[PDB]
């Protein structure tokens, strides 16, 4: 922690390259338009919202960047990757409007997007696919996301995939936002990986939303202390140019001392008062400091500004950041929240019009007019020339990659479709599917296997010797090993999964980790990944409540599919067999990276239990992709039921199928359900369509087409709702669902499958129960199956155990 | 960073107080029993799992703490709160066995707990309610949980509720675990809050599971850098006692330079080699370092050890932490993973029994016997005497608090049960319910309102003036303001919600924040909270997809209830009216903190939308608690339907009820569904019981005791599955569900409710469609309805928008 003054002393400050007065004229129009946009929205009284104070305190920081640093997407690379602070969006839209990229009608539809021609509240690529790039409003995700994006750019260069050397990643943060654990939690990574293509810009207005960050301390000092401690290059932009004569004059070092001893709350107090209150409470703390302004008019005291509002001080910090090599740089920019808004942060509008010398007449002010710069005007010429010199405009986004990939065919996954000699797991199947892909010429180097420490647990160890581990085990290593860091791996996955848009270079990430630590731990990143149109694979290993038996409560996943189904563009599967994994993976590949270029990402849960893997039945492909297909039909003269299973539990549903046939004469149709979620969504779409087209013939849900009306029983390694979600679309009067509701615990797979009530004997008892409620068999036979299977009818509900 | 040697020189090291020789003997028995427990489980070949290498590396650190530092729960306070590293639990179980607290049968049932007399793999209070206290195996959570627990103890003391000055919070962490962003993401708070009652003990063995944490770097230096930068007191325990003479005679300073420049990878390489190797590749790097050991045998060089295995250096560190005030302390304990296990890292166990001089006959090593110390023996006496001096044994847990609280009655919330004057929201209702609680003499000071910065956004600003904000706005402040830190607020909430157990001081926390950032963002903590038996309230404000209209994609919550339902002991509600909010909060208060002491926590979604709040229907109380009650029946002779709604959408369903009756002569039964989830669970419990008792009187789901068989339509502000989950138990053959599936976006409430197809118009069309399919009205009526309401039958499905 250094003195509370600029890191870059004036003697080392480069000459500012732009026309200050002209840039200020342009900036004032941007400030004006951003405010008009939000005010016009308010006028509608539709509780739309929108911020103004924030952008006002940081506009000059962004302005210097737009005039002198931000490289736009170009023929060589995707340009600088800017994670704009979400709340300043009205400012971004204002500039875009000025550069003629957005129309007045769009600004007038700020926060009204349903009818089509509006603008999102915040950066949401999903909502504005050709404009926004990085979802940042969920505080904390932007900084860690940016760190891993920068690391990913380095990876692409080291792999020889693309020269990203001219690209800088900028993460614009708030000082209040830094309290989010994800904000500073991963900063040492930028040091380990020498990310000199990453710049953190923290707007230190000493305020958050409902107050200051730390009123009793000095948030800027805390930030410097930990970033410096983390090995980062720290640049403090504390004071404007007016303090420079004062400082090279305070021979006593008393001013420095005064600046160092004053705390955040007070500096904020000074903000509100005036020159008088300042010359007396601040400069009047000592005679050596009271003497520096003792002969300064008050109004001149009040003109002393913070560095974050001074273009010259800002330019030097970014220029310095740009030159630094070997480590990341963090710029702590000192600003005034609600700067120049007086009163608050038509009299109010009048005040800002005057404050920024905005070209709006008294006659026009009540219309809340937007300002434009005609072709030919000095402002219009300069605005565009600065951007042209920096390759164009940003933000902007390309929704589809341009090259055509030559994807492996399903037949290339041929060995996985036939009966397996050895007993293997769906996880071993996954790894083998990866190997097929690694032999494909077109995509083999585009694949990004991602792991979080654990490789051996998922049988990934063999890949290590074939493609290596990225480690700038060398800079050509292909596998990304992120250590014990679920969020970080997820961020690497997101960067790779969105490379197709960002750098027009499709990369196909496969992130495998404990399914329990997927959506449950990084769910907010998964939702943002959907917003960012991520196209990749999330592989939930060691999944299923009863299957990762020995681990217990915090590891046994009986609900990740309940969490994954809440993401509109995430496609989820829970396969039982190796051939299903093959078919599913081929399809996602095709959908996401084939000509269709569908904006979805896949979630497949895999298992750590080995068992016999049979051959795929001929013609089952489409059923597998759709979510359900009939495996077999077993004869039986005394009854008929339908049995559904998925994942590790399918094997047990089939055992029940034989027990029913063998001991009770009950026949059945056995179906493998590769995705209850995809079937429920299909069912919902059909009922929605039927409701909206009452004069048409009702469409039939696919599951209803595959199944019949005989009483049905379903069992899975997940909570009941996973299978219950398709109830409305199941064409049978009786649909019983078995599931693993309840906290997991340690034991043998057999004991857990009995405790959660999902094993063969419970499937049998459930099936017989339905046939008895129908009369096909007497209740006494279900009561004896119960005694026979040593089933404890009165043990507590597993959900409560 | 400092030099790569012990922070505490020998000359400042206190004399060790215990019987080393004796302690060693006891420690060796614990190591043996720990390994025996895991090996015996392996022998069963049930894939049980379990670790050994980790406890072996950190056993001595824990041993010094069990013999000289850890205070157990006592009459005055809960004792020291130790967050044991999860995978070293076999060693804790071994120590408990030796203390006579666990039986041999229990150890023999390690990881086999379903039948009652076994042990959980890791610390899980839920599974072993009288033993474990803090669930730590989901890495990263323990560190941040510990920080907020330490801060909460301070709170309790500052608030004058309990003197916790004698308690220390210890968080035992792995070095690999520090990569989780949650691990260091909040360490700055420890300095802000001066948590000198907190100690982080980082086991620096230099490796994660799959290799070194940073082979090419020095994690201990990285760790020291960021913690030092964050203001913590850092104590490194680098080298054992045999290095003291070596360091003392090296006047050249070369040994220190050598230690400083050597990276983690090389240090790990030395541990796998031998003395000769070390002489040449380490000491042999320099003439002066070579000379320091020239006079040593290879075997004597081989005996050089890491500090974390030397009790004297360990003690030195912990004692020093105890005397440090004004900030938290972190001890970086340098160890060897797989310590004393040899190469391995039946009989190959005979190697560790020679290594630690275990008294087991090489002839009986085959039976893998446990070692115990008979009463009367030196070992037994010393073991218990050290613990008695420190108040007993740990870990242990008390499942219920002892005092009786005088809870407010429902009548006390009487004002909230009447018709409200002004239109308010359920969030304003929540705040008024809180106010009633703050008037109760018994619990007024036990309440812990927790906010994450956002106060004005939830109408909490009025409580400030009243009970103040905690800030040691002073140290008597009751409200916890945690800033923009959802995980941190969650940790504070967790500490308070479990105070009834750890301190026998029940505290009742109410953590309100944006519902979107609840389970989605801190879901792993919520799962852990369930495991820790938290009793409190999570209030999801600004909830509902369409209700927080302007905010858009990353704020519009239409699914937190899907996430919350996956947690077994979390009770979820989505009330529409203020009186429902009061009845629910009263019930929860009584269930969790009244005589019942139910181990459950509550999740209530509240709204930011004002509307008319009618009086509670007489006798509706229980129905509100159960999840559904009939609001009213509207007459009509052309047809009859059932209409269900919750949250902000219920008033639109009632609007539809009016329309159906007046425009189409269709009458209806209208139901307020306060909890679809509780209804589904009750339904699941009923069919489960019925399936297991086929000859007995079937049980009837609560929802079927309220609804009839007329066709039904349900609409909510959450995805369809929220209402669809009760399909199986709904006693009507037609149950249509409208919901907000799909990504949110910015617009007016009206436009969003129309886009997500859940407004009054769609409920009407859905109801008519059901009647038309029954031939009760003409299909053309439904078609004319769609036209009249300006419904676009062909707009894309909102899930895909
Ligand atoms: Mg800020
Ligand atoms: Mg380690």
Curated annotation (Swiss-Prot), chains A, B:
Taxonomic placement: Bacteria, Pseudomonadati, Pseudomonadota, Gammaproteobacteria, Enterobacterales
Gene: aceE
Molecular function in Gene Ontology: metal ion binding; pyruvate dehydrogenase (acetyl-transferring) activity
Keyword Magnesium (UniProt): yes
Protein name from the UniProt record: Pyruvate dehydrogenase E1 component
EC code(s) of this entry: 1.2.4.1
Catalyzed chemical reaction(s): N(6)-[(R)-lipoyl]-L-lysyl-[protein] + pyruvate + H(+) = N(6)-[(R)-S(8)-acetyldihydrolipoyl]-L-lysyl-[protein] + CO2
Binding residue positions for Mg(2+): 175, 205, 207
Keywords: Acetylation, Magnesium, Metal-binding, Oxidoreductase, Pyruvate, Thiamine pyrophosphate
KW Heme (keyword) present: no
Pfam families for the chain: PDH_E1_M, Transketolase_C_1, Transketolase_N
Physiological role: Component of the pyruvate dehydrogenase (PDH) complex, that catalyzes the overall conversion of pyruvate to acetyl-CoA and CO(2).
Cofactor names: Mg(2+); thiamine diphosphate
Assembly and oligomerization: Homodimer. Part of the PDH complex, consisting of multiple copies of pyruvate dehydrogenase (E1), dihydrolipoamide acetyltransferase (E2) and lipoamide dehydrogenase (E3).
Modified residues (N6-acetyllysine): 630
Record-linked NCBIfam families: aceE (TIGR00759)
Gene3D superfamilies from the UniProt entry: 3.40.50.920, 3.40.50.970
């Amino acid at each position: 922690i250094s003195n509370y003054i600029n890191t870059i002393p004036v003697e080392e400050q480069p000459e500012y390259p732009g026309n200050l007065e002209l840039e200020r004229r342009i900036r004032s129009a941007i400030r004006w338009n951003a405010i008009m946009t939000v005010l016009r929205a308010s006028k509608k009284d539709l509780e739309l919202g929108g911020h103004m104070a924030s952008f006002q305190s940081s506009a000059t920081i962004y302005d210097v960047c737009f005039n002198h640093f931000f490289r736009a997407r170009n023929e060589q690379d995707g340009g600088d990757l800017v994670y704009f602070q979400g709340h300043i969006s009205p400012g971004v839209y204002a500039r875009a409007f000025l550069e003629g990229r957005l129309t007045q009608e769009q600004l007038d539809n700020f926060r009204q997007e349903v009818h089509g021609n509006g603008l999102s509240s915040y950066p949401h690529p999903k909502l504005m696919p050709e404009f926004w790039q990085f979802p940042t409003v969920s505080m904390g995700l932007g900084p860690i996301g940016a760190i891993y994006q920068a690391k990913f750019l380095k990876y692409l260069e080291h792999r020889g995939l693309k020269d990203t050397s001219k690209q800088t990643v900028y993460a614009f943060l708030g000082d209040g936002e830094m309290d989010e654990p994800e904000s500073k939690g991963a900063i040492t990574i930028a040091t380990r990986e020498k990310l000199d293509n990453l710049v953190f810009v923290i707007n230190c207005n000493l305020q958050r939303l409902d107050g200051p960050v730390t009123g009793n301390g000095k948030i800027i000092n805390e930030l410097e202390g930990i970033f410096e401690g983390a090995g980062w290059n720290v640049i403090k932009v504390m004071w404007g140019s007016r303090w420079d004569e004062l400082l090279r004059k305070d021979t006593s070092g008393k001013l420095i001392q005064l600046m160092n001893e004053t705390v955040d709350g007070d500096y904020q107090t000074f903000k509100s008062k005036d020159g008088a209150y300042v010359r007396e409470h601040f400069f009047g703390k000592y005679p050596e400091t009271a003497a520096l302004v003792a002969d300064w008019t008050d109004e001149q005291i009040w003109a002393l500004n913070r560095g974050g509002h001074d273009p010259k001080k800002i330019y030097a910090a970014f220029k310095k950041a740009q030159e630094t090599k070997g480590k990341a740089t963090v710029i702590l920019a000192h600003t005034i929240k609600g700067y120049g808004m007086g009163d608050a942060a038509m009299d109010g509008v009048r005040h800002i019009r005057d404050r920024f010398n905005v070209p709006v007449s008294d006659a026009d002010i009540e219309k809340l007019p937007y300002i434009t710069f005609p072709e030919g005007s000095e402002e219009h010429t300069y605005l565009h020339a600065q951007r042209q010199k920096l390759h164009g405009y940003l933000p902007s986004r390309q929704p589809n990659f341009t090259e055509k990939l030559e994807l492996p065919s399903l037949q290339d996954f041929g060995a996985l479709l036939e009966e397996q000699s050895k007993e293997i797991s769906t996880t071993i199947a996954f790894v083998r599917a990866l190997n097929v892909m690694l032999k494909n010429k077109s995509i083999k180097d585009r694949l990004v296997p991602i792991i979080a420490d654990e490789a051996r647990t998922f049988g990934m160890e063999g890949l290590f010797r074939q493609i290596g581990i990225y480690s700038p085990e060398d800079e050509k290593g292909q596998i990304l090993q992120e250590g014990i860091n679920a969020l970080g791996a997820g961020c690497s996955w997101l960067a790779a999964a969105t490379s197709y848009s960002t750098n027009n270079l499709p990369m196909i990430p496969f992130y495998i980790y404990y399914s329990m630590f997927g959506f449950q731990r990084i769910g907010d990143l998964c939702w943002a990944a959907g917003d960012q149109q991520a196209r990749g694979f999330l592989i939930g290993g060691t999944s299923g409540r009863t299957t990762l038996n020995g681990e217990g409560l915090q590891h046994e996943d009986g609900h990740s599919h309940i969490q994954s189904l809440t993401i509109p563009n995430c496609i989820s599967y829970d396969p039982a067999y190796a051939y299903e994994v093959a078919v599913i993976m081929h399809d996602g590949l095709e959908r996401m990276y084939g000509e269709k270029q569908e904006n979805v990402y896949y979630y497949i849960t895999t298992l750590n239990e080995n068992y016999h893997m049979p051959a795929m039945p001929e013609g089952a492909e489409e059923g597998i992709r759709k979510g359900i297909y009939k495996l077999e039909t077993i004869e039986g003269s005394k009854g008929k039921v339908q049995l559904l299973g998925s994942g590790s539990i399918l094997r047990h549903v089939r055992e029940a199928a034989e027990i029913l046939a063998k001991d009770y004469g009950v026949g059945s149709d056995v179906y493998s359900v590769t995705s209850f979620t995809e079937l429920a969504r299909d069912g919902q779409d059909c009922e929605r369509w039927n409701m909206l087209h009452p004069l048409e013939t009702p469409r039939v849900p696919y599951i209803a087409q595959v199944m019949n009306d005989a009483p049905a029983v379903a069992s899975t390694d997940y909570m009941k709702l996973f299978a219950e979600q398709v109830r409305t679309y199941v064409p049978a009067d009786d649909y019983r669902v078995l599931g693993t509701d309840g906290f997991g615990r340690s034991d043998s797979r057999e004991n857990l499958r009995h405790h959660f009530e999902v094993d063969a004997s419970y499937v049998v008892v459930a099936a017989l129960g339905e046939l008895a409620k129908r009369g096909e068999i007497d209740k006494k036979v279900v009561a004896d199956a119960i005694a026979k299977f040593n089933i404890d009818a009165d043990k507590v509900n597993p959900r409560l155990a």
